[PDB]
Amino acid sequence: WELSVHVTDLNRDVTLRVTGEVHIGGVMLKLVEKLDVKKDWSDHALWWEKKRTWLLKTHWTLDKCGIQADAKLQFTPQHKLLRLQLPNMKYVKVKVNFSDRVFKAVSDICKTFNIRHPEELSLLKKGILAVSQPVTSPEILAKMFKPQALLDKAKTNQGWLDSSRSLMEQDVKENEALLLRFKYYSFFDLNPKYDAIRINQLYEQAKWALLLEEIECTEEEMMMFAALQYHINKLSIMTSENHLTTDVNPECLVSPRYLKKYKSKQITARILEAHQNVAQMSLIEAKMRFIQAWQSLPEFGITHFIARFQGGKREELIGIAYNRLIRMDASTGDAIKTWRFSNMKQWNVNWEIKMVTVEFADEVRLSFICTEVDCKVVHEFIGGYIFLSTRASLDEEMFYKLTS
Amino acid sequence: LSVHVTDLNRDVTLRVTGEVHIGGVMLKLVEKLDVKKDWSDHALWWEKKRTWLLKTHWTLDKCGIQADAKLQFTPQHKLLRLQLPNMKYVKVKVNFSDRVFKAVSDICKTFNIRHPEELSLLKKPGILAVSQPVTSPEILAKMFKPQALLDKAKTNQGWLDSSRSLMEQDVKENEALLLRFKYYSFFDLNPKYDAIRINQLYEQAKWALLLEEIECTEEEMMMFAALQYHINKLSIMTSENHLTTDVNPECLVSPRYLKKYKSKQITARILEAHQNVAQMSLIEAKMRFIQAWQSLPEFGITHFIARFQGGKREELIGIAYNRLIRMDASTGDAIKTWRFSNMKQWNVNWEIKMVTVEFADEVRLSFICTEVDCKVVHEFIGGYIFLSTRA
């Protein structure tokens, strides 16, 4: 028959006569030949929109791929530009492989951003990494303010991407916007000697969650968080300062032998240069105190999903924490019953009725029903947190096994 | 007998049989003196045989007190000016009858300092919490001592016997002793309780570095210098209650609080909470200064002159909390190190003035010190071992 291939970046669709015994790499050759151009085809790969699959297996025939007649597939570069909003609510432009599994893509992104442990992060539907700055006006906070209702937060969690599939397979187009967020609330080895960016973004996600009231806290706690912010800002300013700003003479801070080795001007300089390193360390530790306080909030580390339980009168919530599963009321947010991860044996998903079932120790079983998309997201969340419990180079295959 | 009251300054001759109890003699002294005062703080002591007579129930018979023995009737609490580790002199008053160990604990309980077992006395409220750098380098050079190792080992003889009292160890009133952290094993440094304890420990660390009582590299020196510059800025931060940056406090809270409070209200409560934040930041800053001080290669070593097994000249025995070291008297280089984690036992021969320590796997160590050193060394060893048992 005849194959219709659209070369995206060239804006040229090409008709190609095929038999079906022709291989994948063969179509790509007939494609290049008929185009008669001098271009680097290194990053280009075949894509089938109608069935949402990449065709990366070069050796496979068109029969094994099950490509029918009048099939209109695409020939597009694997790497495309993606708009990412960081936890600091700033947007960044990155090029990423749209063929790679989201999990791999996230790790490559984090490696670029110098963010350790990318397994804690993922993508969510709707220099710059280092510095934390307060907003200019309360107006902005009011503008960015969200409904923040519990049932709406559950609706948001439908957008967590499948870590076992690629961006292109999940309706993500080039130049579109995605949210880079800390998905799992179990942070392994937060080391300030290596995680300057990792901690800053984690602190930002914490700061914004409180400023926009995604997580609740008492008035006393709110003022402490605000005080910590003010302190962090002052400590941040301290890092850029290379000038004496107090009444203390630097020559009183060193042993008398350095007054003979150096001028007063040079000692003052080397102390200020050393001070910026101290202020930089005080800055991170202050942000770490912010995070550990945010970690101790009673409503911390829970991800909400709309679900129906065996004897439910309405739509309820299934809460996923690092250590437990929680049956919650959607109107009050109060826990109806809690199950521990420590007593979990096996969890399975019936995709026919869209029902997730988990059997625990003491022979008590939990089952509930979600929508088709939530079933996949909830399943990955459970397997993810369990994969995170094994932490003590990550085994990506073990992750894919538990999550898929 | 011949008793002499030091307050009123005149002796009293009492006719005694020697059968009278200590308490009875005291009552007779007050009788023949005829003055109105509070005799609560007073007790008897005689320098001839270096003992207090605190046991009132005991008779003069088995006290060994002879006829016309020269006793002295003196108040227990006497004026004592302590130089804190912050190098400031404070005037306090402690029981000169109590053992030094108990006296230190009373001082620390007053000074709001936990774990007084880490502290002791060495020969030569509100001030305890504040740490201000020296106004001028002129004062530093004036305090700067030679501070050789033999000099350090010399002053280490002045460590008071914790099992004895001040009066028994040549300490008169109105004269100065040094309050120092004696053992370098600091247990439970808690910012929620030890605000004064940490500040004084930070001060001892700070002054030891500035006066080169402990040596460090140039990079380390500049780090410590920048560290206390940072501490000073954090100290100032706790003091004031006004906006210092270009940040609107309303940008630091959720918008629901704008509807509940005016701006001045929000600013006030954030300023209040920040002073509490800066206070803990101030403490933790001092904590970091102590950590770096503890991590120094020449940290936590008390030196004593010692002559070893196959020794040539006067060497040094260095006492640490995890080990003790045979050192070079001049350079300070470690010749050999034994660790307390392998220590089986240790004994002291007071005739030879030799200390012998047994370790696991049949390794033995012995050395000889001065008679005064053996007393101090013996307490240092057992002290650290006692400080290893804390749970």
What proportion strand of chain A?
15-25%
Derived structural class of chain A: alpha+beta
Q: Could you give a short account of the major beta sheet of chain A?
A: 7 strands, antiparallel
The Cα radius of gyration of chain A reads 27 Å
Q: Distance between termini of chain A?
A: 37 Å
Encode the helix/strand succession of chain A as letters. Answer: EEHEEEEEHEHHEHHHHEEEEEEEHH
Pfam families (chain A): FERM_M, Kindlin_2_N, PH
InterPro entries (chain A): Band_41_domain, FERM_2, FERM_central, Kindlin/fermitin, Kindlin_2_N, PH-like_dom_sf, PH_domain, PH_Kindlin/fermitin
Region (Interaction with membranes containing phosphatidylinositol phosphate) (chain A): 23-64
GO molecular function (chain A): actin filament binding; phosphatidylinositol-3,4,5-trisphosphate binding; protein serine/threonine kinase activator activity; protein serine/threonine kinase binding; SMAD binding; type I transforming growth factor beta receptor binding
